[PDB]
Amino acid sequence: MGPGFDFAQAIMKKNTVIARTEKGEFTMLGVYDRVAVIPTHASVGEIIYINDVETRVLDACALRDLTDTNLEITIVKLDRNQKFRDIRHFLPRCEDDYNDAVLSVHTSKFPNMYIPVGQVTNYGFLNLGGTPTHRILMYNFPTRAGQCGGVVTTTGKVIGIHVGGNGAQGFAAMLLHSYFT
């Protein structure tokens, strides 16, 4: 509809796959080379399905901050014959608040879905499904099951991936440039 949706669509069309684990179907953001991210609660194993194709996982790292607190991001290196467009230059360097964000989802359940979630707060600490979690972003949108792994963007930045909600608010894990140096 406008330049928020334009940037969101450009990321979705080139930098997303559908990932399936034993815990469900997720939007999966490709960041560079064969490296992608998914919420830690997906429980990535040795094998993952990528666009319904059996794929070996070459490496998987569940990120935690230096206080040993969950960040809810798993970095996955996929045994794929093709690289992602390098989008590391769209990642923020620091924790921040944002205006005018879009949440974009692509799954068998929600194809080509784009949600204008609006203002995004640096929320920080969240007890997510019982698990103390840091670097959470919050938006005042009633996000539903099937949105996990959804990409959060502003015009020109890729700022996080959707990891849950409480029926009134949605929560994303921050993406930072330093995760992918």
UniProtKB/Swiss-Prot annotation:
Catalytic activity: Selective cleavage of Gln-|-Gly bond in the poliovirus polyprotein. In other picornavirus reactions Glu may be substituted for Gln, and Ser or Thr for Gly
Active site positions: 41 (for protease 3c activity), 72 (for protease 3c activity), 148 (for protease 3c activity)
Subcellular location(s) per record: Host cytoplasm
The Peptidase C3 domain, residue ranges: 2-180
Subunit description: Interacts with host IFIH1/MDA5; this interaction inhibits host IFIH1.
Protein's job: Major viral protease that mediates proteolytic processing of the polyprotein. Cleaves host EIF5B, contributing to host translation shutoff. Also cleaves host PABPC1, contributing to host translation shutoff. Binds and inhibits host IFIH1/MDA5, thereby inhibiting the type-I IFN production and the establishment of the antiviral state. Cleaves host MAP3K7/TAK1, resulting in inhibition of TRAF6-triggered NF-kappa-B induction. Cleaves host TICAM1; this interaction allows the virus to disrupt host TLR3 signaling. Cleaves host IRF7, resulting in inhibition of type-I IFN production.
Name of protein: Protease 3C
The organism of origin for this protein: Human enterovirus D68 (EV68)
Part of the full-length chain shown: 1549 to 1728 of 2188
